[PDB]
């Protein structure tokens, strides 16, 4: 409540003094900003400082959260657990062109394949699948 | 179980039927549940009951000649208040204001005396009102004592206990006595040893002068009954049941069946989605509802259209069973939604990974993490509190230096009313902690039976099969898929004694247990067999046998039963059962269907929320 | 109550004076409208469309009908809707009304002309009175006067349509259960509305008009009635002995009125064809 209403201090306050876990308050501070959808503050947890936390229950409280565009900046940090996260996230938030440079980032020629797949006949994609692919399957 | 429902109606509506004249009718709301269970309030109605009110709320009027009180005589709460609405009815009633007192089957004198003492009872008809064993549904007869868990655990209050054996008397009485009594633990050998001394007390009453000597005679149709107790097993009652029915509990609460969300609509066996659904695994249930929407809908949005009579009628007569799936399906359906914001968010697939890795016997220290999670996701208080207690019940005590780190949620996840949870686990001894003089895990023939001792899961895990990895969440070949492999020890301690056959497969868990088998499989009476994990468990054991010249008869009898002549076995659990010993019970009740038919018997169904919200309930 | 008829068109209002009054009663008639001869003229010429002078001089009227002839032409409206029902010309064409009247013992019309007298007689006056509005307002009234079934269905349906867009289910159930409309069809709507009252009413009201001959229908479909009276009932019976807290929620009083009105439409019933069930 005291995130969500803005009193970060007195979140702080509340962590320190009755020896609240920083998983505990991340978590917390993570879920009442998506309520608030607050995308820089989100950020300064997970994308800022790495938590040491799952992928999976994180990006269920931005994705599901409607916010597909936030998740984007998180996507690319997966590879700390697991690297095939990076671009599986992206496909799901429906970013085909960010899933594709992941692809490229981590020389995956087949993920960058199912992109391609995804895009189809539809060359509005295509064009920036194919773009990428030139550093995927190149070298 | 509903064989009882004729008997608990008899009573109620006999004294009813005593008071003449149209009469105003007063229920106990923590009776009253229960009461609805066996009658409708048309039931009463047809009695001459006008108006039904409440003694809680001080609920009075003085429109009718009669005023009766329904009401459990176990607490001056009731005789207060009855008389509290009594003296109010007196001086406003402009008629004789005739009134009757129904209590428990033996009305205390305390109770009557209080009643006496308000100085307008005088001319109060005071009488017995022996309902038990409440037919909750058909495989469980419970006596719907909801605070015995409470009570008989925090002040070890032995009110349920003495209740229990007197109801068990109450049926053993009329459909003959159990030829064998066995049972573990400290309250379940005290209802051993009191159904012993009420046998003697149906043949005192000849010696003492008073009612006619009973003959006693042992049953030809229940073979025996098995008294668990409360603190024999302190793990399974602290783990997430992961069944659909278990979903309902978990999330909302079954009591009555009636529960909150509508109060038109009643969940129990004999809806014909719940009894195939009840025991569904959540990860299943997700998908036996759309498999009963597609059949549903195929029968009942289709298939009918534009038929004639001929064909038509089969649809009709079944269009009312169709009608009602449809309105328990979207009750159904809207379950499914509260355990999916829990699956697609990581909690309660998170708490289940706690609750696997801990029963396997993983250092808990390492499922902390999944934990805090948990409490800073805002989940369900029960939820998170029975975690922070599985652990150190698993382990068998832990050091301060780790058990700090999951009390410090516990105070997190309750704020300041967490002082009374502490306090109510310590005392229910559902938490455990390595400093205490009390932390002393059960050793072989190390003395035990004390109450000083407790269950030694550690040692357990390896003499029975209470790990499981082969479970079939949707075709399950054992107990153990209601936790998804808890295989609790509960159910276990039972199973052990209801066959030969469990007991040869449970034991046979480790490399040095394995070599007992063919020991275990001779244990085709009593503890026989099983005496190696029977002295590792909390408490004392139980094993006794009726007496008289014709007990060799019935046991006979009672051990040639088969499909054609079912006998039926009482498996009594004390300080209250909970839905997932229900769920397990009923799995192996149906494997051992063919040759017997076994009864749940409790002091009370305990709901998942309503151990871990002590501190709640009583703090509201 | 009176209609002034005249050239020009013709006045209506209302005359609600009821009985006694002070002096006069001014209000009579305070909102009456004037209905400018809409097609009256009749179009053989210019002379003939101009209608100088010459119009009806006196108009011929029975309840709810207006009958008159201007320059040849015939038309007769009805009051209930101010729209023309019958529109011809004059059988002699060499002829001109010279003022129309109705013997209100006959309710007949009589029209004169300077060679020739003729009557005006309705086929069904009741009937020809009510289809106007039973199929246009009047559609539950129309479940009984009607002698087609076709158009008992037709007029149940527009009726049912609207109470169940604007929220009256109950309604609906009514005009459903007099009409011959399929069985399932209204169950299916009334389940999905969530309209438990609606959903049991539309059968009772259907077996209050099927009588006996139909019983057969009570006796196939009896298991539905009975599961549908029996599952309220659980409703408000378990309601009250619950507890305390649902007792003081839910009026306890709303809840006695409905268990002896429902219990008794069942029980007087299966009573009555105990012999068929």
Redesign the interface.
Known sequence: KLIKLGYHGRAKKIQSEFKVPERVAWWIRLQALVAKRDWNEIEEISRQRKSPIGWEPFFNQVLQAGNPRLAATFIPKCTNLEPGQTITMYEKCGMRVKAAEEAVRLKDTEAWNRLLEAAGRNTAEGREIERLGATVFKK | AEQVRDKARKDLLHLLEGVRGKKNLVIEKDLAGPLGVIVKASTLRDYGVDNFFFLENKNTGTSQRNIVFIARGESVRNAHAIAAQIKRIQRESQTSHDFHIFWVPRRTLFSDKVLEEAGVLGDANISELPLYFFPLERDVLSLELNDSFRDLYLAKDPTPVFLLSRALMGIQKKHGLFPRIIGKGENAKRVADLLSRMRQELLAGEEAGESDRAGLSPSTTIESVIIIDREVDFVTPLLTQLTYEGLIDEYFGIQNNQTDVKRKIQLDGSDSLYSQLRDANFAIVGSLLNTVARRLKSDYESRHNTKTTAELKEFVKKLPGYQAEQQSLKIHSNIAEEIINYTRTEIFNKLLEVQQNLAAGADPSSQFDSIEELVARDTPLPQVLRLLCLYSCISGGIKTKELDHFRRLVLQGYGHQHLLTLHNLERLQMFLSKSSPLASMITMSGSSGGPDQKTNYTYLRKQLRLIVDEVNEQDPNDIAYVYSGYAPLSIRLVQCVLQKQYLLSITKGSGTVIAAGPVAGGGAQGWKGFEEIVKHARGPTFDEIQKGEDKAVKARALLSGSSGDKKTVFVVFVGGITFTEIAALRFIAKQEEARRNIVICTTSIINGNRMMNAAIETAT | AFAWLSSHGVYHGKLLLKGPLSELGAKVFAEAKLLPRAQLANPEGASRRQLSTEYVDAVALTQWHIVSLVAGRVVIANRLTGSIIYDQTILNPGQKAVGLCVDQQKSTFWLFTPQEIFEIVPRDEDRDIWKIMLQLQQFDAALQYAHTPAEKDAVAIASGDHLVSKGQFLEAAAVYGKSSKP??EV??TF?DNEQ?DALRKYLLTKLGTYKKSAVMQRV??A??LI??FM??????????????????TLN?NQTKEQ?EAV?AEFQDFINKHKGDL
């Open positions: 069985f399932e169950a299916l389940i438990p196939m479909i298991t539905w599961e549908v599952a309220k009932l659980n409703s408000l019976d378990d309601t009250i002995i619950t507890g305390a807290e649902l007792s003081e306890p268990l219990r």
